Amino acid sequence: MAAGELEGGKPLSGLLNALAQDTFHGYPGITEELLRSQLYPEVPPEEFRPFLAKMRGILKSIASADMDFNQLEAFLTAQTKKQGGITSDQAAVISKFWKSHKTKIRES
């Protein structure tokens, strides 16, 4: 209640974004210890994993696997069926992992 939400909607929305630790070589902008400070300054660069226990499946999918739209859409169903998993509040922002960058992007 007072610790089961992770800041708010801002982090969960840019979680898979911050988590970007190993893209291909490592950008001078994003960093492992930076991902937390990026959106979740409350979580430490060590106790972040336990929270990712429900936000890690998407990490290895976008970062370690790098997927596209229509591919992760069906993957999120796993985040809402797994042992406990996340709630409709979280799945709401995560399900956007491919629409947040494929809507008002180039507009065509």
Residue 79 CA: distances (Å) to CA of 6, 22, 25, 65: 17, 22, 29, 17
Q: Where are the beta strands (DSSP E) in the chain?
A: none
Length of the chain: 108
End-to-end, the C-alpha distance of the chain in Å comes to 42
CA distance 78 to 85: 8
Residue owning tokens 């890690």: 56
Q: What share of the chain is helix, strand, coil (3-state, %, to 5)?
A: 35, 0, 65
Residue 64 CA: distances (Å) to CA of 4, 13, 19, 72, 83: 26, 19, 11, 13, 22
Experimental method: NMR
CA distance 105 to 89: 25
CA distance 66 to 53: 19
* Inter-residue contact 80 to 91 (CB < 8 Å): yes
For 80, half-sphere exposure in the C-beta direction (CA atoms, 13 angstrom radius) is 15
Tokens standing for residue 84: 């406990």
Binding-site residues sit at 101
CA distance 56 to 50: 9
Binding-site residues for Cu cation sit at 101
Secondary structure (3-state) at 42:
coil
